[PDB]
Amino acid sequence: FEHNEALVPPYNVLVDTNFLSRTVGAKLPLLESAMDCLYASVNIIITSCVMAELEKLGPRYRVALMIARDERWQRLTCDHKGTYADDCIVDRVQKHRIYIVATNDRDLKRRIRKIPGVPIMSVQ
Amino acid sequence: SSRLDAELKLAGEFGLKNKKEIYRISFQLSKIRRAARDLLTRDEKDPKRLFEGNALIRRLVRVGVLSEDKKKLDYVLALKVEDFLERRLQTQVYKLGLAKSVHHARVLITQRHIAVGKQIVNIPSFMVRLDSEKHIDFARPGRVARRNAARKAEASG
Amino acid sequence: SSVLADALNAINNAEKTGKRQVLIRPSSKVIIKFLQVMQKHGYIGEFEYIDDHRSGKIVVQLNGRLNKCGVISPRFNVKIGDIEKWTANLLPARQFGYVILTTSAGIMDHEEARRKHVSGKILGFVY
RNA sequence: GGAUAGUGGCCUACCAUGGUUUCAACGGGUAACGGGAAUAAGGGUUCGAUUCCGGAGAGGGAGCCUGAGAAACGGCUACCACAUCCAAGGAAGGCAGCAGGCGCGCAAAUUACCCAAUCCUAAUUCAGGGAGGUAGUGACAAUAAAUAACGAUACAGGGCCCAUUCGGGUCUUGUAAUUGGAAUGAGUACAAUGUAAAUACCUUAACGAGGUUGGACUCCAAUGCAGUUAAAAAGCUCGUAGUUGA
RNA sequence: ACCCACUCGGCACCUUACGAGAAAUCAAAGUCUU
């Protein structure tokens, strides 16, 4: 598609809040799942906005938070945690179309496909 | 699309090495099981982790594998694909002078010429290991490789 | 009409309101026993002090997270391909989990009878 | 006792009443023909090879046949039946050991080559071996996955790309120009692992020996559930079966 | 006896600082990643 590649191990993957919930309440090993599909070392991360949003969810749905605050995902310190998870990831990946995005938000995925060179992952 | 820009990537590797197909598919799947079975470390040091260890680790390889480390060979999943590619004559036989430039290479690999220290090796996608012997052999004689030995300084990687 | 979720669904049914726990069923070697494995792993406070008809043994102070709900469950299998699988009931692999199984020997916990390779019935699951 | 060649209720008798059996016996019901190797810390793997094993059919029936040795299929007969040749008169004939056409009709390669082995039978040899083998056919299942490019020069328009709207990017690109090796393919002895013959078809060896789409010549991408509603609560209560049930 | 408060019985209702569901409504259909 005319997109010049320069991705190198370990892949940087932003995991969104929905994916985190999902993998938690269905017992899906998110870390190993990504290393499996990317077939290489992966650094799994979550923006501060995504994990904050989880924090609210965490008030009545305990379990996502702990996994989401795990070193496996390493925090990506965005400048705008206040912005919906969706917009957060979008504004972070818009300058760094480098990072792979794992999201359950088919709306966020659609608007990321626009940007050349953004691997997209999700759970069926 | 990612499908699209992928179908770009592949064509990139399509002479990032030299192929013409989906041997990129070959090497790919390889990388899978390599990782895969491997990544299924998991686990401990089960005397199994042991044999499998220095085992898959004895992937090395020459022209093949990594360099000196691991353990964690998923690095390969990064490489391998993007590394296992070279190694073999398909690659590491242009990067040795003889071959004027990939193309001007596979052709001799085939066309009788180009031989791995005794016996040709038409299988224009062998694999290299302890290479210093990858001469022409030839047995009036293999011309394209016998005089154009500008490889007389092919100190490359 | 079922002393299990009966009272675990009062602790459950409580900490969600938030408080200092309350009364429950009647006692049950089992009630008391889960209302043990709980405490012993944490979660709950101190099983309590009642004694009546069968109303005996305990109330039981709350304390701590314990969020949310003790798990009641209403079938019963176990072991190997099992236990691990019904460990999907769990609120996530990476620790957290606890599945208060029933183990041929001992009313035990997802690991507490993962112990000496045990199995059997599936009594419940905590936090 | 008699058969049985010779064991046996197997029968001649002769009588014993026996005994089988819920551990289900009598018994029933499952078209049932019917089922060997070894490694192996763990793993690695795998086998014998579409049943190692192993009873009952070779029109019907009968009786009979050989014999060391048949319930003799592929011996008879005779009988039946079919079922046939005919100078009238008589005088045939049962290849699930093959192939073949019908059919069946679901479903699959010439009525190849040799007994080259290695096995067969077999009489004092080297009989004969429908064994076996060899083929072909044959994605059959197929695989393989390797098949025009490497390079000489000029000539140069300026480029060509962007999302581009204008900006930007920067810059080879055409020769329907002039070089490359005695590139290589295909034929020729070439004996042949070699169907002692396939043994020239292999493997050689060589001898010789390169020509999808879209876009007007053009043009471009692969050779366990919401549950009121919105689809599913008998009036009302009673309750059995059932469901569960310190 | 009347009333008064106050209790505890349980009366039914009514109500939502709670839980719902797919929403109007619900102290249930609140109700165990939905």
Q: Which bases in strand D are touched by protein, i.e. have an atom under 7 Å from a CB? A: 41-42, 145-147, 149-151, 162-163, 181-184, 223, 245-246
CATH number of the domain residue C39 falls in: 3.30.1370.30
CB A96: neighbour CB atoms within 10 A?
Answer: 13
Q: List CB contacts (< 8 A) between B4 and chain A.
A: 1
**CA count, 13 A, side-chain hemisphere, B65:** 18
Measured CA to CA, the distance from residue C116 to residue A88 in angstroms comes to: 48
Q: Is the CB of B119 under 7 A from strand D?
A: no
Residues of A in contact with C71 (CB under 8 A): none
Chain A interface disruption, residue of C66, C67, C125, C127, most A CBs within 10 A: C67
Query: Residue A75, by phi and psi: left (phi above 0), alpha (psi -120 to 50) or beta?
Result: beta
Task: Give the CA angle between residues A61, A63, A68 to the nearest 5°.
Answer: 115
Tokens of B136: 């022409």
- C11 and C56 inside one domain: yes
In the structure encoding, which two tokens stand for residue B72, read together? 């964690």
Helix residue ranges, H only, chain A: 17-24, 30-38, 48-57, 64-68, 85-93, 106-113
Please state, in angstroms and rounded to a whole number, the distance separating the CA atoms of residues A42 and B69.
Answer: 18
Q: In 3D, which of A39, B46, A111, A33 has the Cα closest to residue C93?
A: A33
| Residue A80 annotated in ligand binding | yes
C-alpha to C-alpha distance for B94 and B107, rounded to whole angstroms: 11
Does residue C51 sit in the same domain as residue C71? no
Å from A68 (CA) to E21 (C1')?
A: 29
Residues C71 and C106 reside in one and the same domain: yes
Q: Which residues contact B3 (CB under 8 A, 6 or more apart)?
A: none
DSSP for B119-150 reads SB---TT---SS-TT----------TTTT--T
Contact partners for chain B, using 3 or more CB pairs closer than 8 A, are A
**Would you say A37 is a known binding-site residue?**
no
List C-alpha distances in Å: C46 to C22, C31, C59: 11, 14, 9
Question: Maximum Cα–Cα distance for chain B, whole Å?
Answer: 60
Question: How many folded domains does chain B comprise?
Answer: 1
Please say which residue of C66, C98, C114 terminates a domain: C66
CA distance C78 to B3: 44
Round to whole Å and give the CA distance between B52 and C107.
40
Q: Which of A3, A9, A38 sits opposite B75 (nearest CB)?
A: A9
Distance CA B75, CA C22 (A): 56
Contacts of C92 (CB under 8 A, 6+ apart): A24, A25, A27, A63, A64, A66, A67
> A95, exposed or middle or buried, with CB in 10 Å at 0-12, 13-18, 19+?
exposed
Of C65, C68, C90, the CB nearest to A27: C90
Beta bridge partners of B120: B115
Would you give the DSSP letter of residue B78? H
Positive or negative, the CA dihedral C7, C11, C14, C16 is: negative
Q: How far apart are CA B68 and CA B85, in angstroms?
A: 18
Radius of gyration of chain B (CA): 18
Rounded to whole angstroms, how far apart are CA atoms A35 and A43?
9
Chains C and A touch, contact meaning at least 3 pairs of CB atoms under 8 angstroms apart: yes
The whole-number Å distance from B150's CA to D119's C1' is 63
* Nearest nucleic acid nucleotide to B110, CA to C1' distance: D146
CA angle C68/C73/C78 to nearest 5° reads: 115
Asked whether B134 and B116 are in contact (CB, 8 A), the reply is yes
Token pair recorded at residue C87: 């460990």
A49 is in an annotated binding site: yes
Residue B76: domain span: 1-157
As for how many domains chain C has, the answer is 2
With touching defined as 3 or more inter-chain CB pairs under 8 Å, the answer for chains C and B is no
A93 neighbors A14 (Cβ within 8 angstroms):
yes
Q: How many CB atoms lie within 10 A of CB A55?
A: 15
Distance CA B13, CA A102 (A): 26
Host domain of residue C53: 1-66
Domain termination site, one of C16, C45, C66: C66
> Is there a single domain that holds both residue C6 and residue C55?
yes
Q: Angle at the Cα of A116 (from A110 to A121), degrees rounded to 5?
A: 50
- My answer on whether C112 and C57 are in the same domain is no
Phi, psi at C70, each rounded to 5°: -65, 145
Counting every residue written for chain A, the total comes to 124
Cα B32 to Cα B62, B70, B79, B128, C17: the distances in Å are: 20, 17, 12, 21, 50
Cis before residue C126, ω within 30 degrees of 0?
Answer: no
CA distance C95 to C116: 19
Token readout for C116 is 């000496």
Give the span between the Cα atoms of B99 and B84, in whole angstroms.
20
Output the 3-class SS for chain C: CCHHHHHHHHHHHHHCCCCCCCCCCCCCHHHHHHHHHHHHHCCCCCECCCCCCCCCCCCECCCCCCCCCCECCCCCCCCCHHHHCHHHCCCCCCCCCCCCCCCCCCCCCCCCCCCCCCCCCCCCECC
Residues C125/C73, Cβ–Cβ less than 8 Å:
yes
- Nearest CA to CA, how far is A106 from chain B (Å)? 15
Name the burial class of residue C37, with classes exposed (0-12), middle (13-18) and buried (19+) by CB atoms within 10 angstroms of its CB: buried
Nearest CA to B122 out of B111, B132, B131 is that of B111
- Kindly state whether A106 is in contact with chain B, defined as any CB-CB distance less than 8 angstroms: no
Q: Smallest Cα–Cα separation from C8: which of C19, C22, C18, B51?
A: C22
Instruction: Indicate yes or no: strand E within 7 A of the C-beta of A56.
Output: no
Q: Which of A117, A124, A67 is nearest to A93 (CA)?
A: A117
Angstrom distance (rounded) from CA B106 to CA B39: 34
Q: How far is CA C14 from the centre of its chain?
A: 15
Q: Which nucleotide is nearest to C17 (CA to C1')?
A: E18
Tokens at A110, concatenated = 């659609």
Distance CA B79, CA B70 (A): 13
**How, if at all, do strands A100-102 and A11-15 pair?**
parallel
Q: Is A63's CB within 8 Å of C91's CB?
A: yes
* Contact assignment for A66 to C88 by CB distance below 8 Å: no
What secondary structure, in 3-state letters, does A77-89 show? Answer: CCCCCCCCHHHHH
Cβ–Cβ contact A36 with B under 8 A: yes
A104/D85 CA-to-C1' distance in Å: 91
* Residue where a domain terminates, one of C16, C33, C66: C66
Whether residues C57 and C78 share a domain: the answer is no
Q: What is the largest CA-CA distance in chain A?
A: 46
Q: Give the count of alpha carbons within 13 A of B132, CB side only.
A: 2
Q: Which of B5, B72, B75 is the closest to A117 by Cβ?
A: B5
Evaluate whether A93 touches A99 at the Cβ level (below 8 Å). yes
Solved how?
Answer: cryo-EM
Task: Give ∠ CA A100-A104-A105 in degrees, rounded to 5.
Answer: 95
**Same domain flag for C77 and C32:** no
**CATH number, domain containing residue C92:** 3.30.1490.10
